[PDB]
């Protein structure tokens, strides 16, 4: 690790300078030594690691999308050589993160919160690479995002209210990979829609910051739902 | 695209 | 060169997917294997060339003034080093920048149409160098900058319309690096002055094209001008 | 800022 050397807080705080600055690389590089340090991290500290990745691998797939369309309509090597390229560095970064909660943030999550968190990310990153893959693999991949994802789904239904923004931002994506990678587009409508009657029940239990938490989160289930319905 | 987070 | 074994056709050909992509970063590596290969660069090369390389520099820079701001106000080591290596990192870009201009650009470059090209894009990497610079290496830097620019205004002025888009984006540049660099606000303010009104009487000159081509860049010299009179 | 190109 290059970050091996630097102090853990030296490392929280850099990622802080570098979302400040959009240096999401540096962010998630930062997050990354943080991590390897081997401590658990904060609810702060897993949005900083979630956030860096999220920016770095948005972009990464941001550009595969362009690229994969102009390789579809042109069907030299070109084109295909750099989607090629950008795919590598996308499943390398999606790698990474999945080597950091495999090794070992998931196991060593000791709390419902922290253990919903990571395994909602480790579905996001499977879904990823689902987006990417095209075989044998593909199938596979679907099927641990799934079970990421549903794992964390249970977790978060007995641990977790149901305005939690955690769980709320899990049923989200949960959504969308049924709709976009699983093609199980009811699937996606339901739980969605679940999700956010379930929530909006809930939000006169919120103090009023948690009200603009759940809300913020359940705009996009509805934004979700507006396009699917 | 639809929306995550 | 890492771009060593790739054709020179491929490297455009992907320099200008990286553009749709918003790989810049990749752009800039693929265009510089490009003037790598030894030959001339044609105009829409020499454009992608500068893009590539003006969108790295340019968000390294929103980078380093966001750090130097929060280190100012902080004013333990991590700001001032963090700071410190996005600083180093923009310089070694300035650096392969000038280089390339250097070995061997600019002395290749048999046109005017290319050498002032060539020159502005001397004097603005210089100027970014200057940007961060903080001593006698500084006063060099600004001398520098101001020469590179100077050499391009006398060949441009001798050998291209007041409304060309190049000796107008030279013009509007050397205006801010008087402004902001060079503590000369008068030579800014009738340096864009002088370029603007003679670029407006030379309008009738030009094709519909053209003059898109050069009130896009005049709209640049009133919006400095309104910021500094 | 003022505008570069
Ligand atoms: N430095 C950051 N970026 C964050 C720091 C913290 C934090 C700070 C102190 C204590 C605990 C947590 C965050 C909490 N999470 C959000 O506010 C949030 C996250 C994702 C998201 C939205 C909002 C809306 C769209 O998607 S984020
Ligand atoms: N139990 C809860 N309800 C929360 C507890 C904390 C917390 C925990 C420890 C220290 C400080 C704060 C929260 C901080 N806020 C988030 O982490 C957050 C995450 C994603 C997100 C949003 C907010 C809005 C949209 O998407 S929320
Ligand atoms: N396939 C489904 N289950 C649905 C079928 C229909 C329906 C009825 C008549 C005609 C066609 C479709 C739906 C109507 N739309 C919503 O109820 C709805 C939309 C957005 C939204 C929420 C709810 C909550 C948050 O944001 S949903
Ligand atoms: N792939 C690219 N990006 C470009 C390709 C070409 C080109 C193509 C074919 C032949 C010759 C040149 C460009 C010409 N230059 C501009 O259009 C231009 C450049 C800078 C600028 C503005 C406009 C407005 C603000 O600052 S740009
Ligand atoms: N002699 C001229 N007037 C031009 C000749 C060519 C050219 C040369 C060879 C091949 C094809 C085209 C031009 C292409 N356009 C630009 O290079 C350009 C650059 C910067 C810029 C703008 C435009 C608009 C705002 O900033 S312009
Ligand atoms: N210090 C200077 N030389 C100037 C001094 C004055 C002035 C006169 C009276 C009061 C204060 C200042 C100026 C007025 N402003 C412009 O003429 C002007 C502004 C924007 C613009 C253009 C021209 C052309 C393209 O976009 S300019
Ligand atoms: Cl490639
Ligand atoms: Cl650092
Ligand atoms: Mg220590
Ligand atoms: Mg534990
Ligand atoms: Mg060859
Ligand atoms: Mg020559």
Redesign the interface.
Known sequence: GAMGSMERA?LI??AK??E????YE?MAAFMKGAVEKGEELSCEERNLLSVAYKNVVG?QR??WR??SS?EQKSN?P??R??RE??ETELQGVCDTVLGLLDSHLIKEAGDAESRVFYLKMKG?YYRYLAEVATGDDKKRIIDSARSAYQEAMDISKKEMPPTNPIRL?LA??FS?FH??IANSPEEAISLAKTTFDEAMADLHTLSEDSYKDSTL?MQ?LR??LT??T | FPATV
């Open positions: 030296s705080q850099k300078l570098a400040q600055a959009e240096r540096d972009g941001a550009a362009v690229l102009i030299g070109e084109v050589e750099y390229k950008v996001d931002g989200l994506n969308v709709y976009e989160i996009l934004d979700n396009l699917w």
